[PDB]
Amino acid sequence: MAFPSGKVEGCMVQVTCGTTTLNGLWLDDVVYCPRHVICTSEDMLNPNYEDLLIRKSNHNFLVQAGVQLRVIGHSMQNCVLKLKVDTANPKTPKYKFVRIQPGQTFSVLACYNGSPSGVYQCAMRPNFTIKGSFLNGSCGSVGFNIDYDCVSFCYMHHMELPTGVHAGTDLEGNFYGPFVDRQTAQAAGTDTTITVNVLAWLYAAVINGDRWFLNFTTTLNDFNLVAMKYNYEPLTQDHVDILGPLSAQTGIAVLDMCASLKELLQNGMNGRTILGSALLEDEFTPFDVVRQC
């Protein structure tokens, strides 16, 4: 389940530089987009964005909203490029730019040529990648949350990695993780499973009649001793306190759910399926499951 995308649909524009075309985010009087739009096929291997953008002018940028906006000011903030435009977006929602932490989730509005094509939910993996579904032209698509009536933009897509996962920036242009916007092989750290998310998932299962996996018990230090072997993030007390409301709503002590999870990690699922999935899902946060109680 992903957030409703209407508020974000009204902010997607088509940006063009040379032959390269990608998507931009038109908020107020500014269009944000990845800076590698100013790149050619040869520049992409190791571009000097300073010297490249220097050779560009406002009239070299063709923003097309549904209309053809006129640029009147351009700068480069980190790995994102900011177009000042004459018109201010009338569909501008209440927004803010936020840099999310690993383990948090968000909805992605996948766009091509400035037109929305689909929406799905992702997670910021511990290694600062995301397992998305992006094709060529998808660059400029943004990830976002919606709290109250405020759109918190947290991601802008830039590139794919040799392993097929994806990397990008916040809306200030700073990459998540150890990545740079050039067409070179870049490795991501060994991924880890978001343990607190798997617990919230098991809770969502119990809420939905799935209880075959409930059992024993364990201590926080004990479970974490088991979890560190399966590349599972260590479960702190903050994680426990985050899962508090789910424990209260269901009546299962957090550590008892942990013990059930340790049983799964050791003895496996044995073919059965939890929530209609044969694997342990870790892209649902406790706050997410609470929003779908």
> Is residue 33 a contact point for its own copies (CB under 8 A)?
no
- How far apart CA 98 and CA 236 sit, in angstroms, is 24
- How far apart CA 267 and CA 42 sit, in angstroms, is 52
- How far apart CA 270 and CA 273 sit, in angstroms, is 9
Q: Which does 195 bind (CB under 5 to 8 A by kind): ligand IRZ, its own copies, none?
A: none
Contact pick of 1, 54, 67, 248 for its own copies (by CB under 8 A): 1
Closest distance of CB 98 from its own copies, Å: 20
Q: Where are the beta strands (DSSP E) in 98-235?
A: 105-112, 115-123, 142-147, 150-160, 166-169
- How far apart CA 28 and CA 9 sit, in angstroms, is 15
Closest distance of CB 218 from its own copies, Å: 26
Contact pick of 4, 73, 178, 189 for its own copies (by CB under 8 A): 4
Determine the size of the site formed for its own copies (CB under 8 A): 30
- Tokens read off for 78: 């980190």
> Which entry of 11, 17, 36, 122 is annotated as an active-site residue?
36
Asked about 139 being catalytic, the answer comes back as yes
Residues 288, 202: contact at Cβ < 8 Å? Answer: no
- Exposure of 111 by Cβ count < 10 A (0-12 exposed, 13-18 middle, 19+ buried)? buried
Q: Site residues for its own copies, window 127-166 (CB under 8 A)?
A: 131, 133, 135, 164
Q: Can you name the residues that pair with 149 across neighbouring β-strands?
A: none
Asked about 36 being catalytic, the answer comes back as yes
Closest distance of CB 9 from its own copies, Å: 4
> Is residue 2 a contact point for its own copies (CB under 8 A)?
yes
Is the CB of 58 or the CB of 133 nearer to its own copies? 133
**What phi and psi, each to the nearest 5 degrees, are found at residue 185?**
-60, 125
Contact positions vs ligand IRZ (CB under 6 A): 22, 36, 39, 44, 134-139, 158-162, 166, 181-185
Is the CB of 181 or the CB of 233 nearer to ligand IRZ? 181
Q: Which does 137 bind (CB under 5 to 8 A by kind): its own copies, ligand IRZ, none?
A: ligand IRZ
**What phi and psi, each to the nearest 5 degrees, are found at residue 88?**
-105, 135
Using alpha carbons, list the distances in angstroms from residue 47 to 29, 53, 156: 28, 10, 20
> Is residue 245 a contact point for its own copies (CB under 8 A)?
no
The residue written with tokens 């032959």 in the block is 19
Q: Site residues for its own copies, window 182-241 (CB under 8 A)?
A: 208-209
Q: Which does 66 bind (CB under 5 to 8 A by kind): ligand IRZ, its own copies, none?
A: none
**What phi and psi, each to the nearest 5 degrees, are found at residue 50?**
-55, -65
User: Cβ of 74: how many Cβ atoms within 10 Å?
Assistant: 18
> Is residue 93 a contact point for its own copies (CB under 8 A)?
no
> Which entry of 122, 139, 154, 258 is annotated as an active-site residue?
139
Q: Which residues are catalytic?
A: 36, 139
Binding footprint of its own copies on the chain (CB under 8 A): 1-7, 9-10, 109-110, 116-120, 131, 133, 135, 164, 208-209, 273, 276-279, 291-293
